[PDB]
Amino acid sequence: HMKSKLPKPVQDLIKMIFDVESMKKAMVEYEIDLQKMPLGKLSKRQIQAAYSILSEVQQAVSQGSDSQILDLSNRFYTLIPHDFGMKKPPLLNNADSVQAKAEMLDNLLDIEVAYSLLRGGSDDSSKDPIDVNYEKLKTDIKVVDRDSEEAEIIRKYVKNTHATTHNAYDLEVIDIFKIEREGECQRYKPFKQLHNRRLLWHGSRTTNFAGILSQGLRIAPPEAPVTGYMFGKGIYFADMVSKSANYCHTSQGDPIGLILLGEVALGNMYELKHASHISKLPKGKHSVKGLGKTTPDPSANISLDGVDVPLGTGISSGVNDTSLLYNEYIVYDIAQVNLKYLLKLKFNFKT
Ligand SMILES: CCN1CCN(C(=O)c2cc(Cn3c(=O)[nH]c(=O)c4ccccc43)ccc2F)CC1=O
Numbered sequence: 001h002m003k004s005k006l007p008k009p010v011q012d013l014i015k016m017i018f019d020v021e022s023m024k025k026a027m028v029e030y031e032i033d034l035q036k037m038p039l040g041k042l043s044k045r046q047i048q049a050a051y052s053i054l055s056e057v058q059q060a061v062s063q064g065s066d067s068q069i070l071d072l073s074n075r076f077y078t079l080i081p082h083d084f085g086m087k088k089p090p091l092l093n094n095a096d097s098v099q100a101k102a103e104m105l106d107n108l109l110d111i112e113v114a115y116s117l118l119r120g121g122s123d124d125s126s127k128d129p130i131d132v133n134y135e136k137l138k139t140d141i142k143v144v145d146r147d148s149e150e151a152e153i154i155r156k157y158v159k160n161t162h163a164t165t166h167n168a169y170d171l172e173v174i175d176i177f178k179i180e181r182e183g184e185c186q187r188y189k190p191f192k193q194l195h196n197r198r199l200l201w202h203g204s205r206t207t208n209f210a211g212i213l214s215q216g217l218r219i220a221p222p223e224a225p226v227t228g229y230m231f232g233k234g235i236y237f238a239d240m241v242s243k244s245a246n247y248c249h250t251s252q253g254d255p256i257g258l259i260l261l262g263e264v265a266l267g268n269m270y271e272l273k274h275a276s277h278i279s280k281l282p283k284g285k286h287s288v289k290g291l292g293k294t295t296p297d298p299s300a301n302i303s304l305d306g307v308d309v310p311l312g313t314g315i316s317s318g319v320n321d322t323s324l325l326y327n328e329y330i331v332y333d334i335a336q337v338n339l340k341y342l343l344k345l346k347f348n349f350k351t
């Protein structure tokens with residue numbers, strides 16, 4: 001094949017996110033049986049059906065027996081096969097069980113998209129598959145120069161917003177990509193001049209990124225249990241890098257992670273201290289802010305392309321009885337997100 005004229009950083013990114021064995025490695029981390037439910041048999045209607053059984057388990061938990069729960073728990077394992085041998089699998093009887101399997105199915109949606117791009121489309125041996133797979137993302141990815149002003153601001157955002165409670169690792173920036181998904185700037189047009197636009201982090205495991213770059217950040221479907229998400233079904237962002245970095249699910253056994261910097265149109269924020277499982281905002285509000293105990297210093301805010309970057313050092317917020325150590329931002333219309341950067345990160349675990 002022609003050998004591909006993309007920059008080396010962009011080529012390594014494509015290999016990373018379209019890695020088939022990584023998708024399998026992620027599936028088994030959720031205790032899925034690849035014998036019964038391999039990567040190829042995975043589909044949206046099975047995932048949605050599973051979500052719905054998870055919604056029924058939510059219902060039985062909210063109204064209090066281990067007899068009826070058993071049947072609902074078993075129907076879930078019927079739809080998404082798990083690896084337990086000749087088993088008796090563990091019972092899904094609490095809110096934690098619901099949250100955990102919801103977060104798995106979230107990931108399965110992104111893996112299904114990644115794999116479907118991989119096995120859809122055309123097969124040309126005279127093209128480098130790196131280029132082939134790059135085109136399927138429908139995203140322009142360019143490497144940012146390490147000396148540029150936007151690189152300096154971004155590295156400072158990474159540097160200044162690592163939390164003391166997440167000090168089991170620290171982060172090096174390897175590559176900074178400027179990204180532009182097809183049609184997203186057009187979709188963002190109604191919110192482009194809205195007040196309170198903020199450049200915020202979103203981390204995910206690397207096996208979600210083909211899905212994210214092709215489909216954008218999305219809302220979990222109607223079938224998903226709204227109780228499974230702290231502030232309902234929306235797109236979640238953080239202003240502290242380490243909080244988002246945790247959702248990469250790096251380890252000593254694979255600490256290369258990817259993280260997004262997106263422009264989020266927050267507008268009039270509906271501020272909350274504790275969990276609230278809503279499927280729609282109250283009138284006049286464009287986002288939810290989960291109020292952190294700590295927050296980046298408001299005096300140290302900086303502008304990048306007319307978007308506030310909250311890159312100050314973490315200080316006290318003056319909020320008392322909150323569930324959240326750090327801030328959290330949720331939007332409930334996918335048109336309120338414009339993804340601007342993607343960072344490849346080097347996790348230095350000190351444990
Ligand atoms: C089905 C696709 N999907 C559902 C998962 N998703 C989210 O934004 C999302 C993400 C999380 C977890 N999470 C997360 O994965 N990354 C974060 O940076 C983050 C920051 C603050 C709070 C939660 C975070 C929890 C619920 C969610 F809905 C976007 C998304 O595209």
